[model samples]
Every structure is written in structure tokens, then in C-alpha cells.
Target: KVFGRCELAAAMKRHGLDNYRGYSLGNWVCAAKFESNFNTQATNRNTDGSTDYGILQINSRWWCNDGRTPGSRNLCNIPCSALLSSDITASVNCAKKIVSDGNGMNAWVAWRNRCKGTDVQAWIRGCRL
Candidate 1:
């Protein structure tokens, strides 16, 4: 699903991501914007041969099973294909697991490069929440 800015905000917020782990909803909004442009079908093949999937770009190496990543732990115990679905429940749940695993939002390079320490609140501006 391709989401508009406020649409993405509402989706993520409703999934209980608001202020998750001290990270504001805006932070998540910014990260998802840069990571996948709110495109749920997005995927990126890394140089290491691992593919990231879905809106939050969960990594195949440690998060989801793509049936290809060598020694994949499948920590989230869901197929990578599940992340590409319009239903983002698995994606959002896995994203929470990613942060709870101590990686924080920095798991996505885009988050570190574009979302961190900036005025992320702007990402959610004009959203009804």
C-alpha cells in the first residue's frame, strides 16, 4: 500500500507505535518516510545479500525469513513476504521487536542518516493523530 503522509501517521499510531521506547511517533513517521517512502511493497537488496522488506524495511538477515539469507535467524518468525502485504500488523510488530532487540530505529540506515536528532515532529504536522 502506498500511504500518504497523514495516512501513514494514523496507521502507525493506531498500531501502538506512538512514543514507542521514548521515540516519538514523528520519529517513526520520519523513519518510515525515508526508509520506504510509505510504500509497503518496498524492498532493498543489501550488498551483503540480505534483503530488507516492507515499509519499515525489516531486514531478512535477522528479522524475517526470506528463505535465502544464509544462517537467517528468523527472529520474527514470519516470512519476508508477509512484510510486503497491505496489512502492516506483522511489519509493525516486527519493527517493535527490532527496537526491543536493542537496535532502536538505527537498524535502518535511512533513519540514522535522515531521521535522527532532527525536528522529526515536522513529519507528523497537520496529521489528526
Candidate 2:
């Protein structure tokens, strides 16, 4: 629901992306941009019957439970719906867990295909974090 890029960056920092596992914040920003366009409420159902949710598009297959989704492992121990909130508590915490598990930004397909090895400097450019 934010209306500006700088605000989003600031929020991400305040919410703990700054030192979260030493991963590149810009890479995380790139992944979020590609996956959900910064819309926290974003959701997509895959053809394989799994769904991705939230700013980072955490997948039901391994990250969260969506109730109707079958075969979900829910490693984050949170409802997928919680990921869609403006609070971003669940989304950021779950993403932190994912990265800390040694997955790095590779946990997101958007990051692998769109951000990895790319210069994402602009994602955090001029943000007063």
C-alpha cells in the first residue's frame, strides 16, 4: 500500500533487512520487484497447484500453509494469508528464515532468474538507510 520507492526501502531497512544474514538488500529488492511489484497482497497459483504469496512470493510448497493448497510443507509455520499483510511481519521473518537456512536469495526464483549476477544497485540507490 506504499506509494513511493524510497518509503518501501526505508520500511525494509527498519523492519530488519539491513543486517539480515549479510545478504544483499538490493538483491532482495530486485526479487520483490519481479515477484510482486512491491504489492504485499500479491498471490499467484502455479499450474502445479502450489501458490506463491507476498512481497517475496514465498511458495506454499515449502514455506507456508494456504489451507486449500495440498502438499504444503509450511516450514515458516505461518498462514500464507499473513504474508499478504501490510505489516510485512510474516513476510520478512519468513524470508529471513529462508535465507538463514543457507538458501540465500536463491530461495526466490525471481532472484535467480532476474537478480542474480545482475547489478541491482538502483534498488537501494539514494535511500537514506
Candidate 3:
């Protein structure tokens, strides 16, 4: 229950993610599309027995948990349930933290595989933002 590309772009812009740490918005928009297809409640079980949660698909291994752990890194200090919601504040913050840790959005397999070196401008194409 969220947005199409235009509104998603608008939302991201409103949340001040259009530019992050001097990187282009594509750094995330591309990854978000590839990761969760902008679906806020998206979740996927990983081969490592971890799950990726929400729009940015924060991983359970070193990020958040689905109440299924004694606890791992819990890097965002929030639960996996937090990421499964449409309220993206904590999710976005945690995504930034992941990017800040090193190599920018390289933390995401989607970013490295589908986003990087691609024509990512299409992520915002035709968006009036």
C-alpha cells in the first residue's frame, strides 16, 4: 500500500533522500526497485537463514530481526517488524547506516548487481519531482 515511481520518487525526495552523502538518488532508487519493488511489506528468506525485510530489504544477519534471534548486530536498533511497515523512517535510517558503513550502497547485492553501472536515471524518469 504505497507508491508508483512518481510518488515513490516524491516520497523519497520529501524524506531528503534525493541526495545522500553526495551520491545520486539512483544509488537507492535502483536498489529499492530491485530489492523490494517498492513494496513496503516485502520479505524474503535468505539462504543464510536470514530474511530481508521491507522496501530496502534490510537483512537480518547484521541488521534487524523478526523476533527470531537472541539478536545479531541489530544495526538500526529496530526490529525486523519495523522494516516490514510502510512507515519508512527507521528503514531509511538503517539503510543510510549501511551505506555509511562502507562502499556506499554496495551493502546491497541488488545495488551491486542490478543498479551499478546501469542507466539508473529511468528510476525517476517522467516523475514530476
Q: Estimate each model's TM-score.
A: 0.97, 0.91, 0.91
Over 19-118, each residue of candidate 3 has an lDDT whose tens digit, in order, gives 7875577667788888999988998988767889988989988988666644557878887888877767777888878888878778888889998888
Which stretches in model 2 have alpha-carbon errors above 4 Å? none
lDDT of 1 by residue, 28-94 (tens): 9898898899999999999999999999999999989998999877989999999999988999999
Which model, 1 or 2, shows the larger TM-score? Answer: 1
Q: What does the lDDT come to for candidate 2?
A: 0.83
Root mean square deviation (Cα) for candidate 1: 0.8
Query: lDDT of all predictions, in order shown?
Result: 0.91, 0.83, 0.80
- Relative to the unseen true structure, what is the C-alpha lDDT of residue 72 in candidate 1, on a scale of 0 to 100? 73
Question: lDDT by residue for model 2 over 24-72, one digit each (tens)?
Answer: 6787787789999999988999988999998888989889998877766
User: Best to worst by TM-score, what's the order?
Assistant: 1, 3, 2
Could you tell me which 10 consecutive residues in candidate 1 have the lowest summed lDDT? 99-108
Best by lDDT: 1
Candidate 2: the clashing residue pairs are none
Give model 3's TM-score versus the native structure.
0.91
Judging by TM-score against the true structure, name the best candidate.
1
After TM-score superposition, the amount by which residue 12's alpha carbon in candidate 1 deviates from its true location, in angstroms, is: 0.6
User: What's the distance in Å from true for residue 34, model 2?
Assistant: 0.5
